[PDB]
């Protein structure tokens, strides 16, 4: 076809990351492009993980023997930190402490679930300048959401960041409100 | 321990669930609608109007 094809470009492009924040998360995954947080444990014991499943990329997926300004990297940046155990009060301000003076405009982190078994904590931790919303958010945000499986009551993060529109690094150069001249 | 189940919904299963429920057999992707929008934007399917 061609319709049933360019979908298969993406719907193959999709299940991969189902297979990536499952197997390379503890090994520090950020996003296919392979963007990453930590990058040795992705190779392996000089070869243990590099090819442990490229050899399974084929003998599952029809092949042959031979062929911090991102939220999805920061919403798991320290999702470990929780299921390892710290205060959910100051640890959350640390990450928005972190990215904000990394020349970044705005950040926001929420944690939802049972802090103590009730109608369930939902407290929210913001810092900065977060445009939202219109079209300028698709350009300027990253947001990820990862279910956190601790032993008594699932919880869940919703991190958001935003790109400094000044030091944009691609696309528009500032907020579409922009006004300036010289005296 | 098996009998004819060639066609129909018992035949087709969700890729992420094997959920026979909510099938969308359009464009040869074969996922359910509960299931798809979670994994929507990463296929280049976006929202404009």
């Amino acid at each position: 076809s061609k319709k049933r094809k360019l979908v298969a470009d993406g719907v193959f492009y999709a299940e991969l990351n189902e297979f990536f924040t499952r197997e390379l998360a503890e090994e520090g995954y950020s996003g296919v492009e392979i963007r990453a947080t930590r990058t040795q444990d992705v190779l392996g014991e000089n070869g243990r993980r590099i090819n442990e499943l490229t050899l399974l990329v084929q003998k599952r997926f029809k092949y042959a023997p031979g062929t911090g300004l991102s939220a999805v990297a920061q919403a798991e940046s320290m999702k470990f930190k929780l299921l390892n155990g710290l205060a959910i009060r100051r640890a959350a301000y640390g990450v928005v402490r972190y990215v904000m003076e990394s020349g970044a405009k705005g950040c926001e982190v929420v944690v939802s679930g049972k802090l103590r078994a009730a109608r369930a904590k939902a407290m929210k931790f913001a810092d900065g300048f977060l445009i939202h919303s219109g079209q300028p958010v698709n350009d300027f945000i990253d947001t990820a959401t990862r279910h956190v499986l601790m032993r008594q009551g699932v919880l869940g993060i919703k991190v958001k960041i935003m790109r400094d529109p000044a030091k944009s690094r691609t696309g528009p150069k500032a907020l579409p409100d922009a006004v300036t001249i010289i005296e | 321990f098996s009998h004819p189940r060639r066609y129909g919904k018992g035949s087709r299963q969700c890729r992420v669930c094997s959920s026979h429920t909510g099938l969308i057999r359009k464009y040869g992707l074969n996922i359910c609608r509960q299931c798809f929008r979670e994994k929507a934007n990463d296929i280049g399917f976006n929202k404009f109007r």
Binding site: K3, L6 | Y27, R33, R37, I43, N46, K47
Partner: peptide, 30 residues
């Protein structure tokens, strides 16, 4: 060439409660 939008109209909710709100995603080829 003429472009053909690929449209998938699915209802916005996992269950069957709320107002009957739909939403169309597009794939825009070229």
């Amino acid at each position: 060439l003429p472009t053909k939008v690929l449209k998938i109209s699915t209802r916005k909710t996992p269950n069957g409660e709320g107002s009957k709100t739909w939403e169309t995603y597009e794939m825009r080829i070229h």
